Amino acid sequence: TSKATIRDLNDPSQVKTLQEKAGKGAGTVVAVIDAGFDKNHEAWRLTDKTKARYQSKEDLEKAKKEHGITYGEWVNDKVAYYHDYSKDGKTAVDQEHGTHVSGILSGNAPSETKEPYRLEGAMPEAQLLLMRVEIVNGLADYARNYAQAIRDAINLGAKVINMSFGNAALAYANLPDETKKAFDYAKSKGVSIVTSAGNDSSFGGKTRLPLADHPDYGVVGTPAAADSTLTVASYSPDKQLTETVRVKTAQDKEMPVLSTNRFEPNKAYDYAYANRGTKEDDFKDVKGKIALIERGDIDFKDKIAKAKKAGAVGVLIYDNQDKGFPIELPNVDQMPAAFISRKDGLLLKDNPQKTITFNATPKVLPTASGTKLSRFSSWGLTADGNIKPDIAAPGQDILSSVANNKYAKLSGTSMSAPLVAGIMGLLQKQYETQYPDMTPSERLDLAKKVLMSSATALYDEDEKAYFSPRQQGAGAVDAKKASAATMYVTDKDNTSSKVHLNNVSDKFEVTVNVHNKSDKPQELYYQATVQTDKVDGKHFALAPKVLYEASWQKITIPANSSKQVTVPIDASRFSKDLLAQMKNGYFLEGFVRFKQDPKKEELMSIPYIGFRGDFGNLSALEKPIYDSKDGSSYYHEANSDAKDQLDGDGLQFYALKNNFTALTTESNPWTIIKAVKEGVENIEDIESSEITETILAGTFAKQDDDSHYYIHRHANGKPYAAISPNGDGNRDYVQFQGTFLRNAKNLVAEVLDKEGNVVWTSEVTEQVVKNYNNDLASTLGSTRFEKTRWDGKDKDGKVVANGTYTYRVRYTPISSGAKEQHTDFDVIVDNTTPEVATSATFSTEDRRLTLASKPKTSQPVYRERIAYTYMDEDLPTTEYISPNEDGTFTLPEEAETTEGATVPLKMSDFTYVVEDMAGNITYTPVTKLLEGHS
Ligand SMILES: [Ca+2]
Ligand code: NA
For binding Ca(2+), which residues are annotated in this chain's numbering (predicted)? Predict the structure, then answer.
């Protein structure tokens, strides 16, 4: 018959209450800017097209003509306009994400749908403008393209623009000027722009906690960092519509599942516990059953693959966290795989009857998380220190429209944003009747303030404190409270419903202006929470710590007026213990919460954030790896048995290892140097078995090579960085590699001669983004800055004199007024070629080679060796002999191949190779030394 909608069962943000007041979007236009869409999805329909702004393609083309828009097309009655702003892209168009976002905003699935419940988004009777943008030619081009989409959406009549995309940590200041002006244009026209906060958690990413020493751990980027947009974080309500399983316990019992691929509904499956699935013995009894597997130790896909190997028909993976979130499991060759909570997995593990049934229709059940901010949701602050996100909305396991007329659950701030966008659109409609004498810009400003003020500050029940405003903004959107609101709260300058205090001492004041738009005076009680970061050892826990709550005050605000209040804060008695945990300073933040009576529910809340310290001047760069006491850094674990081991790149394709602050250089072995100087064109895997390797400056192999490099240091503890700028590719240069804890600007390298002169300056790297993860899917843990490469030459192109120089790297934080920072390395330049024996004698009896003289080098000797190069399956293969203690070398008679065959060695196979610590090198055939007699 007529199917219920999802919202009929499950409306965590109370959208129905606002729809009762303001409608469902008929006659309104909204826009979605995303990566691609299924433009034909069944969810794209209007109940009554006669009420639409655009009743035909001709209506659309008329509006296109009035604004000089000569591109884009009408699609159907719902999708009034589509344009692809990134058609020069070579990659295939991804349709899932944009369709899913658009469905939350404006899906209107028919009752003929195959799904059990109709997807009905927040503004299901609005028309859509669908604008595709994707990164093709860099981020500035990308922002110019979505700036045009914004401008076109405004001029085609969109009242709301949803942008569920972003690039982490980027500064607003670095956006193209035309992108900044597009945001301002939307604001000036009363068009709301809603942005997703991002799914990057904090510095370090969703698998890591940031270090307590480094409080500027925000990763919100652009477009979200634009102040005029409304930026949306993700949380889980304490209940959610979910697919379920049924089990008989020690009575029936229903449990939430999140399934990848499809179990057979209404089928009783047997299941068997397989521990964490880390060995084959784990799966000894899963054949023909579902494998119950605890999260941990290994990847999900590995657990699932091994269960499939053992004959399992499906997989249940249960969390190793208490109060966790469902995680969408990977699709491994269509294997049914469902994620369940720890409590439910432990229940099944010890359950007598190991049988389980999957239900075909979903139902609302409590979440394992309770009311809790999503672990993936991006934290503020922005790069220049502004407060983002602004607000939170449900973004866990949201069911919406995807490609090919299908539906699926996705999690992300991308899902939270379009729900807020639809609430914004409907509240703007309400205000067209409620405040008709306001301009569109005034109504938009009011709507943003009311949404943020009326948003409910979410409370962390585990920590007994409100989640940080740098995680939840002004709280969880509530369309019922928003629609009912006749008041709102702002900072003292009336610019936004949040208070940014910048740097504070232990005593400060939180000032709020309380705005009353009703015709009657109103009395409110208000109380400030005072809170900071919880710390576990050396890490932020990414959880709140309450310090205290101020005493309740009250105020009466006259009708159609505003009144300022001030809450004094004094955290002085906490400072000793807080500095012990957060030695470079810490946030002092919280919410001013307003009620009609202290015993009633929260009516409004406004977040405030200050930083007890000097935020702008926090170190932007992680200290060089060389200075680490234990050899570890944020993204690099030391070898516990050899803290000075520090290997180079090897033959790795991706640079996932050894991400830290350091200088790079290159090791070029003598066989490659020789081949290049002889003009050999095809070297690798052909002329030599040795490799050119990018390594860390100041590292050196042992003479008997164990395949590792080790830091060497001057007696003063600085790394022994040294270069030989003679153009052979062996240690010719140094180049800065940085793990940036904070964004920075105007990064430049220069060389001081330690006599008072700058002798060389690099080109400037204008924009530096913090290394907020160490993952190919986002960013690596360190960045190599090619512009800083120093070839040992001065500003006139002349190699500097042999000596020690300061290689200085300068960079400035983004924060207003921050001082320039710098990090210095001593670098030795020495181009003296080793002076070595030109003759030798050879004793056949004991096979000892005696050199006529010993090496004389400017820098200390690095290696003095005899190489032998022998054929191994058509490849000249080089191994090395170290000197005897009497200075001779014992030459072997044969070598052994990898496959085990004996290869006789000839005198012509041996080469004498001497190298110093700057990379200066000589290589002489042993046969030439033996001929060095008259
Ligand atoms: Ca060199
Ligand atoms: Na609020």
Answer: 724, 726, 728, 730, 732
